[PDB]
């Protein structure tokens, strides 16, 4: 005899279906079959329905506004002469007027999102022609956006979304579904966050570690957001098109005085393609910033050339400049030489040397 299913929860799907969900008891090492009993008690119709399901969830089509749903589930072993569990504790869910499906949308800039609504007026479902939509109670949405999907339900379609600008604490735009002039209290939440986060890396002058940095300035608008850099290491080189990989590991980043997070990769694999992105784990959903692949050997910030010597050649009268090529990188290098009269402000003349095997240059002065 299994224990009754636990954690019975009820959420509304993006389709406007009532999704009943529960957790399997943690102690059964075998699949369970469930029987779901639910009743729908409206002011005008009582419906009872018994459904048997092998999944840990049930969809109930078209939630009725101003109705109360009572649900019970019991489990039995799927294979063999199993005994039914006792029923779960009854859970009552009494709905409120006006339906949004979905209740919330978490998206990125440039995407398309659409909402659907049903408006219940005095135990009656109004026609879709009557329904009008509003944003943040400030202004009516243009009629061109509305589409009549069905007689009961109206829909708004948004295109080329722009970032939601925060008003005080609130990061999101409140979308309202109203019966003509008069609106209702409940609204739908639309969250648009700039995911365009630049991750730049720099390998130290000894090439012993790689430090990567990224700014918080676009994300200081969302309280409760947590930020986690994730990375995937390739065996060799970076792909032509970087992409999110299902198997990724987090990296410890530390906020610096300059407002940037600093993450040190040590040891570093110079010729392994490190694909990185920021994971934004909102209370409802996870977003990955556009992935970029970085090769540590190709992002080296070299040390300055050492043993720089500038001498004017006797008899010849050329400014002969010499140096020692800097330790890193050992790749062929192009060099840039700035020179000018020494003073409070130096008028730098620029000169570029593209010979890899060049260690000294003579420039007329």
């Amino acid at each position: 005899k299994p224990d009754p299913p636990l954690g019975l929860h009820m959420e509304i799907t993006d389709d406007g279906n009532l999704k009943i969900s529960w957790s399997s008891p943690p102690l059964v090492p075998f699949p369970l079959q469930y029987q779901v009993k639910y009743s729908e008690n409206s002011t005008t119709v009582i419906r009872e329905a018994d459904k048997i399901v092998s999944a840990t969830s049930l969809l109930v089509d078209s939630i009725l506004p101003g109705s109360s749903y009572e649900v019970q589930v019991r489990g039995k072993r799927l294979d063999g002469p199993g005994i039914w569990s006792d029923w779960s504790t009854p859970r009552v869910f009494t709905t409120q007027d006006v339906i949004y499906f979905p209740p919330k949308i978490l998206t990125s800039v440039g995407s398309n999102v659409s909402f659907h609504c049903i408006y219940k007026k005095e135990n009656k479902i109004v026609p879709s022609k009557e329904i009008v939509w509003w944003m943040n109670l400030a202004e009516k949405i243009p009629q061109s956006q509305y589409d009549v999907v069905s007689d009961h339900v109206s829909k708004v379609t948004f295109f080329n979304l722009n970032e939601t600008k925060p008003r005080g604490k609130f990061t999101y735009d409140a979308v309202y579904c109203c019966n003509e002039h008069e609106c209702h209290h409940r609204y739908a939440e639309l969250y648009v966050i700039d995911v365009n986060i630049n991750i730049s890396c720099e390998t130290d002058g000894y090439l012993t570690k790689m430090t990567c940095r990224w700014s918080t300035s676009t994300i200081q608008s969302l309280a409760e957001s947590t930020l986690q850099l994730r990375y995937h290491r390739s065996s060799l080189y970076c792909s032509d098109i970087p992409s999110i990989h299902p198997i990724s590991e987090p990296k410890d980043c530390y906020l610096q005085s300059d407002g940037f997070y600093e993450c040190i990769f040590q040891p570093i694999f110079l010729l392994s393609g490190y694909t990185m992105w920021i994971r934004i784990n909102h209370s409802l959903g996870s977003l990955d910033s556009p992935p970029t692949c970085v090769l540590p050997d190709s992002v080296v910030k070299p040390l300055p050339p050492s043993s720089v010597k500038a001498e004017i050649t006797i008899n010849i009268g050329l400014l002969k400049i010499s140096w020692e090529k800097p330790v890193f990188p050992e790749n062929n290098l192009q060099f840039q030489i700035r020179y000018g009269l020494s003073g409070k402000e130096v008028q730098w003349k620029m000169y570029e040397v593209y010979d890899a095997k060049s260690k000294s240059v003579s420039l007329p002065v």
């Binding site: 110079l270 890193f328 990188p329």
Partner: protein, 146 residues
């Protein structure tokens, strides 16, 4: 995958490790070619004619460098791994199948030298690495074969 770019990068990684060893002042004063008894397991200048030989040489060096606590040395071991990977892609562009070299099975002896004399192991390993890399760099234009 550009073959020429990979070849140049292979050259670069070799020069890179050589220069790193050059930065290490104590190693510079030590003769690369010179033989030191006990360190013989370290792959020093002995003709490295082929890619498989290069791969096993770099593998042993990686294994030795990994064990020594030094910030520079860990990176050098990493560089050696990348060099091995570069050699593997070159062997692929040449239609060669390079088996992934394991390090030396015979590390049960290396512990003794590391405990008794850390300095000798480090200076020898670095100087011989620099020498081996230099001949490898010389030979990489000679049309290396598998």
């Amino acid at each position: 995958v550009p073959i020429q770019k990979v070849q140049d990068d292979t050259k670069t990684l070799i020069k890179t490790i050589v220069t790193r060893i050059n930065d290490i002042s104590h190693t510079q004063s030590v003769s690369s070619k010179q033989k030191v008894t006990g360190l013989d397991f370290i792959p020093g200048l002995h003709p490295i004619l082929t890619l498989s030989k290069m791969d096993q040489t770099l593998a042993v060096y990686q294994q030795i460098l990994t064990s020594m606590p030094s910030r520079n040395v860990i990176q050098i071991s990493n560089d050696l791994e990348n060099l091995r990977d570069l050699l593997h892609v070159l062997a692929f562009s040449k239609s060669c199948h390079l088996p992934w070299a394991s390090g030396l099975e015979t590390l049960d002896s290396l512990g003794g030298v590391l405990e008794a004399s850390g300095y000798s192991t480090e200076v020898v390993a670095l100087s011989r690495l620099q020498g081996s890399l230099q001949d490898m760099l010389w030979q990489l234009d000679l049309s290396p074969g598998c």
